[PDB]
């Protein structure tokens, strides 16, 4: 009923999910000249030392690397956030070509891909309750450009053959998400939404300024995945990004000058 095709893509989602035309939809274009430095912002705290990855799943629209979120093992705090947000999963959005694939844009520039580390606010007890709140989620977004390989991505790339098609999963223990982060934690932040149905307006977005580099070969492996299930006609999992939405009555803040 939804996907990224002509007949079921972003331009159709509002029929089932009218919140698609809402007041705080994501992604957005980040106009770097209009974002404003906010001295109120507290420092960003990424505490991933005790992370427990569990599994990788092809869900038909991306692949998710899932974590144990039943304790404070991998948490995000600080920045614009009040309280503690637990890592539940990360995934990527990517293109068919190196010139598109990101959801956020920077001065209209599209990156080859975008990494989303998804966290939920522990005050709400579980993910499902968190997505019903305006401050339920915090998503750390990281752009990917093609150039040098990212060593810490390789273990992800190499399991993708085992989850080619929708509904396939594989064990994926002992993966360290710190190996996917750039050097700087400088960021932009704004209030937004999920970028997939049901498009809930529950996300504090924290988008890092510094991209990571991945190799051609690494992105090419993303592009070998399938949206379809096994035994269905093959449709490459590419261009699984929603385009930028209207900013409306929001101001993007920067953590840096």
CA dihedral 109, 110, 114, 118 (to 10 degrees): 70
Residue from 77, 86, 110, 116 in contact with Ni ion (CB under 5 A): 116
Measured from the CB atom, is 116 or 209 closer to Ni ion? Answer: 116
166 touches Ni ion (CB under 5 A)? no
Nearer to Ni ion, 116 or 221 (CB): 116
34 is in an annotated binding site: no
Kindly state the smallest distance separating residue 37's Cβ from Ni ion, in Å: 26
| Helix/strand/coil percentages in the chain, nearest 5 | 15, 30, 55
């305006």: which residue's tokens?
A: 134
Q: Which stretch binds Ni ion (CB under 5 A): 77-85, 113-121, 205-213, 227-235?
A: 113-121
The answer to whether 168 touches 102, Cβ cutoff 8 Å, is no
Cβ atoms of residues 124 and 131 within 8 Å? no
119 catalytic per annotation = no
Closest CA to 87 of 152, 200, 178: 178
CB of 204 to Ni ion, least distance (A): 14
Q: Which residue is nearest to Ni ion (CB)?
A: 116
93 among annotated binding-site residues:
yes
* Stretch near Ni ion under the rule CB under 5 A, chosen from 28-36, 116-124, 156-164, 217-225: 116-124
Are the C-beta atoms of residues 54 and 87 closer than 8 Å to each other?
no
HEC secondary structure over 202-213 = CEEEEEECCCEE
242 binds Ni ion (CB under 5 A): no
Q: Which residues are annotated as a binding site?
A: 91, 93, 116, 195-196
Residues in the site for Ni ion, rule: CB under 5 A?
116
Residues annotated within a binding site for substrate: 195-196
Active site residue ranges? 61
């Amino acid at each position: 009923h939804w996907g990224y095709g002509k007949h079921n893509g972003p331009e159709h989602w509002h029929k089932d999910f009218p919140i698609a035309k809402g007041e705080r939809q994501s992604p957005v274009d980040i106009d770097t000249h209009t974002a404003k430095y906010d001295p109120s912002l507290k420092p960003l705290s990424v505490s991933y030392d005790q992370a427990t990855s569990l599994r990788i799943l092809n869900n038909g629209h991306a692949f998710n690397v899932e974590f144990d979120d039943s304790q404070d093992k991998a948490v995000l705090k600080g920045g614009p956030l009040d309280g503690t947000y637990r890592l539940i999963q990360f995934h990527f959005h990517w293109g068919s070509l190196d010139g598109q694939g990101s959801e956020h844009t920077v001065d209209k520039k599209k990156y080859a891909a975008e990494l989303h580390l998804v966290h939920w606010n522990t005050k709400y007890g579980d993910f499902g309750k968190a997505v019903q709140q305006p401050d339920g989620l915090a998503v750390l977004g990281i752009f990917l450009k093609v150039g040098s390989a990212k060593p810490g991505l390789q273990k992800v790339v190499d399991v993708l053959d085992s989850i080619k098609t929708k509904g396939k999963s594989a064990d994926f223990t002992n993966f360290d998400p710190r190996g996917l982060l750039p050097e700087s934690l400088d960021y932009w932040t704004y209030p937004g939404s999920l970028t997939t149905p049901p498009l809930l307006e529950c996300v504090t977005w924290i988008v890092l300024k510094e991209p990571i580099s991945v190799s051609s070969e690494q992105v090419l492996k993303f592009r070998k995945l399938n949206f379809n299930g096994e035994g269905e006609p093959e449709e490459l999992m590419v261009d699984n990004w929603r385009p930028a939405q209207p900013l409306k009555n929001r101001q993007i803040k920067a953590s840096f000058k």
